[PDB]
Design a protein around this ligand. Structure first.
Ligand SMILES: CN[C@@H](C)Cc1ccccc1
Lengths: 234, 289, 57, 127, 338
């Protein structure tokens, strides 16, 4: 009514217009990812690879097929994560990088993944699993000095999957070891998945350039399955 | 046959009541809850509005025409009623087609879906589905070019039909078949076939992944969605487009059952598109308490 | 050295806390009750004010 | 006040057996998962075993399967770790870790450096 | 030696336990059993403030009881005029992951922070009329969980690095640092006089801090899990803590002991936020089941429920005049109840 009330309403309308502009760009047209990994992991190399496309949290922005991705990596945070990891309950996917060549810490990585998977607030978030350090894993397997079955006795009985596609120059032992690790993660993935979220394993290296495309395709698949489930098509 | 026609009146009254009520629940639920305020739900809300207006503005007079076998409301109101009939039927079909297109973009363009299928484009879709049918129907009916070249046949059919009917010529029949039914129906069928293939592939992949270690929902859902539409509309439109070439052999009561299948489509649309999905039911229960 | 220093600081804090002058629970409950009784007539949420006087009509 | 007290330990010959026990108080013992973690000299904390609220589901680390077996007694509010076939690499301080929240299936920070709901720890040495 | 020091700590803990046991001559429940209950409390959603794109993580009331600042994890602070629902400001944050916000008692500034470990101060009354980042307080080695203004120049913040800190906004330096918590400090509450404040942290412990001396005066325990929320009683002689074990508890500073426990067998979800009404008779608590239980603070009876939020209730505040209650939620809507 009055001049002051009209001015307040006009300011509110301008604020709403700016909010409408913001709700499209950087709010709904961009996909947010959480990047997780241990100290020995190579998630820094993953960030460096994705870049070509004193405290707090680190953000990486990259584009694939004109789709905007914001990948977040926690910086100066303590080792207790049951509180600040609730902030990421709505990200499209979680990038989980694992040092597959470190047998001694594979169980620690598996427990990390299991806690991430079974969390109440991350109960609907798909995990993109990067089994990093494949070259180092190959060297360690070929050397034979480290007995992988001494950490995981089930490996003495595990047989490589029939559909396991190996590299042209992959030694059979390397394939068996890498697929054993992948299946160790996938057992946790499937033992508690009610179809609300899925895990997408990938074998990666520090020199690999396909990680951005992997993330793009996996986010596409995640959202496609989410929509299919929403419309009772899945 | 007083008793039989009274039973028919009761049956058509029941159909109108279910259509009106179900569409009213859909409209109120979508418009009330801010939880459901999303562009796809607004497409569904517009479709429900079209169905409700078909229920209240069109069906009862066609019931009178069917039960009394004649028109009591005069030439002017018959023209208005035919125009509204055609407009609202085509608007409902267009809404179905646009919902299909939205679903196609949701499933086959997951990453850019939220940016593409925004409120502006959905409003454009609603405007098209409300306007193109209106212009087409009213222009055809009031300018009388639907029966151009068939004046005597049109009048003979009108007299036989009980006072007035939905009459088309060969060219007008083909044109209305291509506009109201064939194009939206083909778009819907193609997009839903693609969605079916994608859903089957994804289901097979998930099943294989879960089988390597340690329901056919798409078939059921898409079968319901496409079968309701086909059963309701395909017979009427096919027979109507074939009729002028057959030289108008369709006798009364057959057009009646067919157009009442068409109305049954509007009766069922809320069930197929709103009540079928658990989220809408959850919102409705939230309304209950 | 870190553990023993932590223990020393913890025992110092525990002494500081043990030096507190505590009050009987009955008096604390009585004081809380007295505050609630005194300020009951000024709590719009306890006793809804008429729609004519609340701003969120 | 939440407190967990482990008991048992000391020297033992290789191939020997131990029965580690933890007495828990200050919380509803039956509402939480319970874990066993250990820290060998010069190494970080390592998760050893786990057991659900009712004891229905249990887990072990690879190097422990077939040797240790975790047990839970909700009536007595006591957690046990029967340690058989001990080996020199088992020489470590054993802590009992409480799940941070009740009724939850995840155990996020049980193995962290300064987790609040861990026990004081008991030292186990194998000759 | 370490063993001797820990044995001394055990002896001192026994001393404190016995001393506070001697003071438990009665219980608040049996003292208040003789007063009639407040009754079946009813509150209706007067306003529903929408406009946030993502989950709301915190909100705070201005001292005038009209303006309202809320923080959302879409990277936006919005100042609402609760009377008219109009927006007053929309501050774009440099970091999307805001976990807390504050409103200066004078209303000139607002503060916020989160996973960036930085408390940013925004000048709401810039001469040019555009909100500017007045200061960016850095130094905490963990996410900011809470922050509260003492005045236009001093602010107290709690962080996930287990420490609270008192800052001078003008200079931007940590005037005082509060240490002693074993886990993340999750909530904070200044006393009415701002001479004292209490912080609830993981390790299921609450501590009372004196801002001038900069030391812990009392440590309160009794919760079985993390303390997610804490609020001072209007009198300032007591406070209430909400925990992850689905329980609220009331502590008295002078009794140095827990007085009452607010729990029900059918409630098993954790508590995210607590607040008192103006008289302190009603204790409002938010839960992970997106309900809010209105507790009779003196009787421990559920006086009512606030329902209507679609997703987790994250924040909850009562106006200075006690006229209304604002609750935010992970569904991105704020609701004013009365
Ligand atoms: C009964 N109302 C439709 C059955 C008539 C019609 C004809 C052509 C196009 C659309 C609609």
């Amino acid at each position: 009514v009055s001049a002051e009330d009209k001015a307040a309403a006009e300011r509110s309308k301008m604020i709403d217009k700016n909010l409408r502009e913001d709700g499209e760009k950087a709010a709904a047209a961009t996909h947010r990812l959480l990047l997780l990994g241990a100290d020995n992991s190579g998630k820094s190399t993953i960030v460096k690879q994705m870049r070509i496309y004193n405290s707090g949290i680190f953000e990486t922005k990259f584009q694939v097929d004109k789709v905007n991705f914001h990948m977040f990596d926690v910086g100066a945070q303590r080792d207790e994560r049951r509180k600040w990891i609730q902030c990421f309950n709505d990200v499209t996917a979680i990038i989980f990088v694992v040092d597959s060549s470190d047998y001694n810490r594979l169980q620690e990585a598996l427990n990390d993944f299991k806690s991430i998977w079974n969390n109440r607030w991350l109960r609907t978030i798909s995990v993109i699993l990067f089994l990093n350090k494949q070259d180092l894993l190959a060297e360690k397997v070929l050397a034979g000095k480290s007995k992988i079955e001494d950490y995981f006795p089930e490996f003495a009985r595990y047989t490589t999957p029939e559909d396991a596609t190996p590299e042209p120059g992959e030694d059979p032992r390397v394939t068996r070891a890498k697929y054993f690790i992948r299946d160790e993660f996938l057992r946790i993935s499937t033992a508690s998945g009610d179809g609300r979220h899925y895990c997408y394993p990938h074998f990666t290296c520090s020199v690999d350039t396909e990680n951005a495309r992997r993330i793009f395709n996996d986010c596409r698949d995640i959202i496609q399955r989410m929509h299919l489930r929403q419309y009772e098509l899945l | 046959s007083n008793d039989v026609r009274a039973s028919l009146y009761s049956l058509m009254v029941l159909i109108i009541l279910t259509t009106l009520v179900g569409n009213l629940i859909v409209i109120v639920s979508i418009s009330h809850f801010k939880q459901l305020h999303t562009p796809t739900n607004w497409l569904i809300h517009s479709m429900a509005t079209v169905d409700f207006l078909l229920g209240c503005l069109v069906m009862p007079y066609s019931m009178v025409r069917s039960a009394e076998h004649c028109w009591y409301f005069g030439e002017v109101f018959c023209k208005i009623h035919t125009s509204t009939d055609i407009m609202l039927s085509s608007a409902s079909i267009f809404h179905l087609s646009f919902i299909s297109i939205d679903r196609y973009y949701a499933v086959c363009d997951p990453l850019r879906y939220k940016a593409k299928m925004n409120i502006l484009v959905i409003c454009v879709m609603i405007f098209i589905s409300w306007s193109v049918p209106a212009v087409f129907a009213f222009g055809m009916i009031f300018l009388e070019l639907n029966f151009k070249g068939a004046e005597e046949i049109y009048y003979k059919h009108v007299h036989c039909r009980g006072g007035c009917s939905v009459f088309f010529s060969k060219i007008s029949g083909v044109l209305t078949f291509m506009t109201s039914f064939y194009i939206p129906g083909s778009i819907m069928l193609c997009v839903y076939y693609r969605i079916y293939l994608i859903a089957k592939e994804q289901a097979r992949l998930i099943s294989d992944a879960n089988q390597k270690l340690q329901e056919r929902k798409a078939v059921k859902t898409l079968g319901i969605v496409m079968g309701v539409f086909l059963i309701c509309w395909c017979p009427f439109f096919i027979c109507t487009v074939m009729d002028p070439f057959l030289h108008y052999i369709i006798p009364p009561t057959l057009n009646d059952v067919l157009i009442w299948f068409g109305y049954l489509n509007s009766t069922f649309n809320p069930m197929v598109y709103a009540f079928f999905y658990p989220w809408f039911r959850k919102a409705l229960k939230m309304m209950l308490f | 050295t870190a553990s023993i220093a932590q223990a020393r600081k913890l025992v110092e804090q525990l002494k500081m806390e043990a030096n507190i002058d505590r009050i009987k629970v009955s008096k604390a409950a009585a004081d809380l009750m007295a505050y609630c009784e005194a300020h009951a007539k000024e709590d719009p949420l306890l006793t809804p004010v008429p729609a004519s006087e609340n701003p969120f009509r | 006040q939440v407190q967990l007290q482990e008991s048992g330990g000391g020297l033992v010959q290789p191939g020997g057996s131990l029965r580690l026990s933890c007495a828990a108080s200050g919380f509803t013992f039956s509402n939480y998962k319970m874990n066993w973690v250990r820290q060998a000299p010069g190494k970080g904390l390592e998760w050893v075993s786990d057991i659900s609220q009712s004891g229905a589901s249990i887990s072990y680390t690879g190097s422990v399967k077939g040797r240790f077996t975790i047990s839970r007694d909700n009536a007595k509010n006591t957690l046990y770790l029967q340690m058989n076939s001990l080996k020199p690499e088992d020489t470590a301080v054993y802590y009992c870790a409480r799940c941070p929240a009740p009724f939850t299936r995840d155990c996020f920070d049980v193995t962290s450096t300064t987790y609040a709901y861990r026990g004081q720890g008991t030292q186990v040495t194998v000759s | 030696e370490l063993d001797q020091l820990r044995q001394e700590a055990e002896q001192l803990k026994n001393q404190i336990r016995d001393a506070r046991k001697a003071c438990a001559d009665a219980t608040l429940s049996q003292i208040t059993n003789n007063i009639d209950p407040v009754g079946r409390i009813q509150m209706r959603t007067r306003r529903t403030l929408r406009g946030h794109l993502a989950k709301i993580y915190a909100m705070h009331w201005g001292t005038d009881s009209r303006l309202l600042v809320s923080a959302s994890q879409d990277g936006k602070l919005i100042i609402w005029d609760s009377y008219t629902t109009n927006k007053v400001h929309a501050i774009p944050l440099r970091s999307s992951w805001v976990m807390t916000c504050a409103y200066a008692p004078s209303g000139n500034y607002v503060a916020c922070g989160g996973l960036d470990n930085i408390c940013s101060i925004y000048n709401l009354k810039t001469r040019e009329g555009n909100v500017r980042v007045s200061r960016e307080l850095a130094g905490h080695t963990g996410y900011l969980s809470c922050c509260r203004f003492l005045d236009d120049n001093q602010i107290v913040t709690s962080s996930g690095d287990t420490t609270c800190a008192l800052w001078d906004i003008e200079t931007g330096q940590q005037t005082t640092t509060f240490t002693g918590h074993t886990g993340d400090v999750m909530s904070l509450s200044l006393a009415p006089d701002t001479r004292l404040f209490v912080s609830g942290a993981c390790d299921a412990s609450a501590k009372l801090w004196d801002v001038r001396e900069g030391m812990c005066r009392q440590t309160f325990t009794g919760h079985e899990s993390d303390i997610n929320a804490i609020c001072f009683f209007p009198n300032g002689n007591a406070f209430a803590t909400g925990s992850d074990d689905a329980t609220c508890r009331l502590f008295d500073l002078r009794a140095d002991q827990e007085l009452m426990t607010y729990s029900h067998d059918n409630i098993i979800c954790g508590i995210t936020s607590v607040s008192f009404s103006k008289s302190g008779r009603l204790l409002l608590a938010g839960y992970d089941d997106f309900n809010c239980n209105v507790w009779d603070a003196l009787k421990a009876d559920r006086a009512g429920v606030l329902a209507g939020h679609d997703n987790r209730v994250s924040c909850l505040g009562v106006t200075d005049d006690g006229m209304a209650v604002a609750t935010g939620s992970w569904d991105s809507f704020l609701k004013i109840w009365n």
